[PDB]
A paper describes a structure:
GH19 chitinase hydrolyzes the glycosidic bonds of chitin, namely beta-1, 4-linked N-acetyl-D-glucosamine. One of the physiological roles of chitinase is to defend plants against pathogenic fungi by degrading chitin, a major component of the cell wall of many fungi. We demonstrate that this remote loop directly accesses the fungal cell wall, and surprisingly, it needs to adopt a defined structure supported by long-range intramolecular interactions to perform its function.
After we confirmed that the tree topology did not change based on the presence/absence of loop regions in the MSA, we used the tree based on the unmodified MSA and selected five ancestral nodes where InDels of the loop regions occurred, designated Anc1 to Anc5 based on the presence/absence of loop regions in the extant sequences. Crystal structures of Anc4 and Anc5 solved to 1.13 Å and 1.57 Å, respectively. Overall, the backbone structures of Anc4 and Anc5 were nearly identical (RMSD of Cα = 0.478 Å) and the orientation of catalytic residues is similar, suggesting that loop I and II addition/removal did not cause major structural disruptions. All five ancestral proteins showed a similar level of chitinase activity to the two modern GH19 chitinases, while Anc5 also exhibited antifungal activity. However, removing loop II from Anc5 decreased its antifungal activity by 12-fold while removing loop I did not influence its antifungal activity (roughly 1.02-fold increase). Some of the 45 substitutions support the stabilization of loop II in Anc5ΔLoop I. Structural comparison of Anc4 and Anc5 revealed six substitutions forming new interactions with loop II regions. By fluorescence microscope experiments, we observed that only Anc5 and Anc5ΔLoop I bound to the surface of fungal hyphae. This result is consistent with the result that Anc5 and Anc5ΔLoop I showed 28-fold stronger antifungal activity than Anc4, suggesting that the acquisition of loop II is necessary to access the substrate in the cell wall of fungi to perform antifungal activity.
Residue numbers in the entry: 0 to 237
Write the structure that this text describes.
Amino acid sequence: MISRSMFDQLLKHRNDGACPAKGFYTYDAFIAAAKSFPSFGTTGDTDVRKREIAAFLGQTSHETTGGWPTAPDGPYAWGYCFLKEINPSSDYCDPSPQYPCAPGKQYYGRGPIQLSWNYNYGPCGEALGVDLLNNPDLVATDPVISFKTALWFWMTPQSPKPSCHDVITGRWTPSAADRAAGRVPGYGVITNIINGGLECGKGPDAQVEDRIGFYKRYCDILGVSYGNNLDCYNQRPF
């Protein structure tokens, strides 16, 4: 587990006035959230535990980045700047008898994984013990819940698609079809899990490069190797 000083060095600009999420993403909220998922950051040897935190913070930093190319400390120091999706194009409501949209509510991206859609807020809240279908705004008002939604995503498989956790800790072994699709363990298949439909299997991509930039900077500061297969440029989406 990373210390407060390390967390603050990785996420160095999140509390700048420039960032809408200033003050929200506290180290204490991160540690409290992680307690609900005790295998997070505790699975594997010392390098794997650090790498899991780097990979989780890298991907979520991309989803919340306020960086730009000439920014102080570079663009990979501007993770966790945003809390809420900027200019959402809809309510993100896909009505469902299992997940019915609450009146007046919107399911645009919120928190470190930019949780989106009623049918993601629904099962996430159920797993956390919180009604996020009916109060989705909790993901942008309660920082412990906010971090918990991102850890829920990270830790929950959509079998046969694996959890990000299982990939980075070595607990996922690709099926033969996965191998035929180019999906092998590494940060690249984590990008594929998170947004592969739009970002993977099509050559270089500025979004993927941003995810990797954060991960590399965090691995550098934590003192761990990146692992192999960092991109998904040659992977079929799941």
